[PDB]
Amino acid sequence: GSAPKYIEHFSKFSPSPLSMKQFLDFGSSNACEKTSFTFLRQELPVRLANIMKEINLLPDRVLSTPSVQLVQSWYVQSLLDIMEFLDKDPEDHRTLSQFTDALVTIRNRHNDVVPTMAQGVLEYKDTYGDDPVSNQNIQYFLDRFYLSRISIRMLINQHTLIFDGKHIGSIDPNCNVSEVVKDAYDMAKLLCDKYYMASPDLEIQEINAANSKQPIHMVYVPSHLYHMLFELFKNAMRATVESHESSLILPPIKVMVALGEEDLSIKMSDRGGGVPLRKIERLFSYMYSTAPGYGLPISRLYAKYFQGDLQLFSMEGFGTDAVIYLKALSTDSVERLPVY
Amino acid sequence: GSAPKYIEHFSKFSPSPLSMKQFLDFGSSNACEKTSFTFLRQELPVRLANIMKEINLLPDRVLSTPSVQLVQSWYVQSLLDIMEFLDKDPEDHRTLSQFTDALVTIRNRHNDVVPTMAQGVLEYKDTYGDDPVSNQNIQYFLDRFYLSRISIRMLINQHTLIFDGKHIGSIDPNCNVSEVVKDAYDMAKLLCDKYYMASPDLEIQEINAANSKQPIHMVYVPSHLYHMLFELFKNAMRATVESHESSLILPPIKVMVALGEEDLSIKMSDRGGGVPLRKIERLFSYMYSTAPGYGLPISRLYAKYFQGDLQLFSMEGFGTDAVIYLKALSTDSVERLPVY
Ligand SMILES: O=C1Cc2ccccc2N1
Ligand SMILES: O=C1Cc2ccccc2N1
Ligand SMILES: [Cl-]
Ligand SMILES: [Cl-]
């Protein structure tokens, strides 16, 4: 076929990272659908081909696995589905309506990639071992693969949500961080109450440095923020409950939302007994987090996707702090795409 | 001369990292002076030669500087001073008394190496620039150089202090961490009061997980702990005072000392306005911390010297947490020497 020819071609192009502003401009009006089509029919093959080229550069012991080949088959099909529109005409509303339908299919085709790539890590550990060099190479590849996957789904979500026929697709220009915190907590609480018959309470404190007592808002993707906060709450609650099983006091989970000139930082503090430093440094490893999971490493990728970060600092015997670092300004919020 | 011949010889040996137990065994009695002499007259040339060999592997633009050559001259002289005792007899008390006197001279000869190596970094920045690749290479070398320097001074201090003619040299087998915290604070307070005419107050809280309300003790080098806590207090006070100049409230500096099964963690929390993440990641860089300083990067080396760490997590607009990670058990407290 021509799949190898198409990967090599678009592999020569570099992905074009977009800013929050550019995302808001693309979603400003439904009339923009044409510019989004002409941009995505070139950008999506470029991002797909770039990661598809790195997949083919993996060692043959990884490249010949059924998991990598299954995912590579999805990417080849997705690439070909998008390349059909390269010659079509943007002015034909059927060309655009078909593109939107083709993106939704591509998105659903890749819905089960995270657990599939997680099966590959487990297969590797049992077929070749869990050495540190394998950890760094798996970590390096998966971080870049998943980050690419986040970027592609972001592009697809922005087009399919806005051009469907206050919120700009998946972006909330006035995202109230404390409200997303509460939502993520309420969901973790429900699960914690169902499993442990007890849940820690929530305390939130905001620190708007420049405008005290003004609610902290930002331009961000609330779904991404929810995912990070939901994973952290699940860990903080699990630790808080299991560490106080022999006690009556169930210490609360405290969340500080701080807004500075550059950073919007969200710290989650628990008293769930803490974790030795030796293990904290392994909670972000795909291989060590795999067992016969990836919430934290992927959560950190969501934070990094827009020039943020996610860091953990524990105190064995007391508790653990988790901090989501985000860019406070939409001008500094730019896609972090893997460097190919 | 034979200095190049001696470096190459002892460079083939690997440094022998010692544990807290081994340090306590060497200092158990003054009678041990012979075993310490026979060990140090081989180990000190090995550690000196190993770092001296890496110095000679630096690029000629760094190796030909007056700072690197001045320090290399001190190391060559120190190496030669120690090699004089290789053939001498341990049973002669004059051979031992001369060794002790020779170690003190070597220690004082290298007293001004940190500021000298800091002058070299400044010279490099102005002669060749402050690029990221230069930062990583300078960071890599200085971290290993200073860590080696800490290890050598530790060996010398343990011999000269114990074999001078409750505390085992520089090691306190029952180091009360909160007392060292108070000492470091009281010194930073004095300086802060002298310079700013105002100082934050101190609050300490201990969390002895296994034995609640029992004071937290450990086997450690209190001088090293003081240095780390003193640097952190100076930063936390500077930020706390300068960030509240237009205010009346001067928030306190809060310190938690937590003791777990594996870690003894010390967190210093201030409300000095915080620092953007972009800059926190540069506070441990020698090059970016150099200006026409190294307290934090060296403090982290002291923490790592016995398998610990020092980490900073800030929240721009609020404050900053600094955590010293130490090993709680003397069995896990082992020298971290550079890997040559
Ligand atoms: O004990 C723990 C481990 C952890 C990871 C992430 C968030 C909170 C916590 N608490
Ligand atoms: O603002 C700051 C920066 C810093 C470094 C180390 C310790 C405390 C602080 N506070
Ligand atoms: Cl995917
Ligand atoms: Cl030195």
Curated annotation (Swiss-Prot), chains A, B:
<dbReference type="GO" id="GO:0034614">
    <property type="term" value="P:cellular response to reactive oxygen species"/>
</dbReference>
<dbReference type="GO" id="GO:0005654">
    <property type="term" value="C:nucleoplasm"/>
</dbReference>
<feature type="binding site">
    <location>
        <begin position="293"/>
        <end position="296"/>
    </location>
    <ligand>
        <name>ATP</name>
    </ligand>
</feature>
<dbReference type="InterPro" id="IPR005467">
    <property type="entry name" value="His_kinase_dom"/>
</dbReference>
<comment type="similarity">
    <text>Belongs to the PDK/BCKDK protein kinase family.</text>
</comment>
<dbReference type="GO" id="GO:0005829">
    <property type="term" value="C:cytosol"/>
</dbReference>
<dbReference type="GO" id="GO:0010906">
    <property type="term" value="P:regulation of glucose metabolic process"/>
</dbReference>
<dbReference type="GO" id="GO:0042593">
    <property type="term" value="P:glucose homeostasis"/>
</dbReference>
<dbReference type="GO" id="GO:0006111">
    <property type="term" value="P:regulation of gluconeogenesis"/>
</dbReference>
<keyword id="KW-0808">Transferase</keyword>
<feature type="modified residue" description="Phosphotyrosine">
    <location>
        <position position="196"/>
    </location>
</feature>
<dbReference type="GO" id="GO:0005524">
    <property type="term" value="F:ATP binding"/>
</dbReference>
<dbReference type="GO" id="GO:0008286">
    <property type="term" value="P:insulin receptor signaling pathway"/>
</dbReference>
<dbReference type="InterPro" id="IPR036784">
    <property type="entry name" value="AK/P_DHK_N_sf"/>
</dbReference>
<dbReference type="GO" id="GO:0010510">
    <property type="term" value="P:regulation of acetyl-CoA biosynthetic process from pyruvate"/>
</dbReference>
<keyword id="KW-0067">ATP-binding</keyword>
<comment type="subunit">
    <text>Homodimer, and heterodimer with PDK1. Interacts with the pyruvate dehydrogenase complex subunit DLAT, and is part of the multimeric pyruvate dehydrogenase complex that contains multiple copies of pyruvate dehydrogenase (E1), dihydrolipoamide acetyltransferase (DLAT, E2) and lipoamide dehydrogenase (DLD, E3).</text>
</comment>
<dbReference type="GO" id="GO:0042803">
    <property type="term" value="F:protein homodimerization activity"/>
</dbReference>
<dbReference type="Pfam" id="PF02518">
    <property type="entry name" value="HATPase_c"/>
</dbReference>
<dbReference type="InterPro" id="IPR018955">
    <property type="entry name" value="BCDHK/PDK_N"/>
</dbReference>
<feature type="binding site">
    <location>
        <position position="270"/>
    </location>
    <ligand>
        <name>ATP</name>
    </ligand>
</feature>
<dbReference type="GO" id="GO:0004740">
    <property type="term" value="F:pyruvate dehydrogenase (acetyl-transferring) kinase activity"/>
</dbReference>
<protein>
    <recommendedName>
        <fullName>[Pyruvate dehydrogenase (acetyl-transferring)] kinase isozyme 2, mitochondrial</fullName>
        <ecNumber>2.7.11.2</ecNumber>
    </recommendedName>
</protein>
<dbReference type="GO" id="GO:0005739">
    <property type="term" value="C:mitochondrion"/>
</dbReference>
<dbReference type="InterPro" id="IPR036890">
    <property type="entry name" value="HATPase_C_sf"/>
</dbReference>
<dbReference type="GO" id="GO:0006006">
    <property type="term" value="P:glucose metabolic process"/>
</dbReference>
<dbReference type="InterPro" id="IPR039028">
    <property type="entry name" value="BCKD/PDK"/>
</dbReference>
<keyword id="KW-0547">Nucleotide-binding</keyword>
<keyword id="KW-0597">Phosphoprotein</keyword>
<dbReference type="GO" id="GO:0045254">
    <property type="term" value="C:pyruvate dehydrogenase complex"/>
</dbReference>
<dbReference type="GO" id="GO:0006885">
    <property type="term" value="P:regulation of pH"/>
</dbReference>
<feature type="binding site">
    <location>
        <begin position="289"/>
        <end position="290"/>
    </location>
    <ligand>
        <name>ATP</name>
    </ligand>
</feature>
<dbReference type="GO" id="GO:0005759">
    <property type="term" value="C:mitochondrial matrix"/>
</dbReference>
<comment type="function">
    <text>Kinase that plays a key role in the regulation of glucose and fatty acid metabolism and homeostasis via phosphorylation of the pyruvate dehydrogenase subunits PDHA1 and PDHA2. This inhibits pyruvate dehydrogenase activity, and thereby regulates metabolite flux through the tricarboxylic acid cycle, down-regulates aerobic respiration and inhibits the formation of acetyl-coenzyme A from pyruvate. Inhibition of pyruvate dehydrogenase decreases glucose utilization and increases fat metabolism. Mediates cellular responses to insulin.</text>
</comment>
<feature type="binding site">
    <location>
        <begin position="231"/>
        <end position="238"/>
    </location>
    <ligand>
        <name>ATP</name>
    </ligand>
</feature>
<feature type="domain" description="Histidine kinase">
    <location>
        <begin position="122"/>
        <end position="330"/>
    </location>
</feature>
<dbReference type="GO" id="GO:0004672">
    <property type="term" value="F:protein kinase activity"/>
</dbReference>
<keyword id="KW-0809">Transit peptide</keyword>
<keyword id="KW-0418">Kinase</keyword>
<dbReference type="GO" id="GO:0072332">
    <property type="term" value="P:intrinsic apoptotic signaling pathway by p53 class mediator"/>
</dbReference>
<dbReference type="GO" id="GO:0010565">
    <property type="term" value="P:regulation of ketone metabolic process"/>
</dbReference>
<dbReference type="GO" id="GO:0050848">
    <property type="term" value="P:regulation of calcium-mediated signaling"/>
</dbReference>
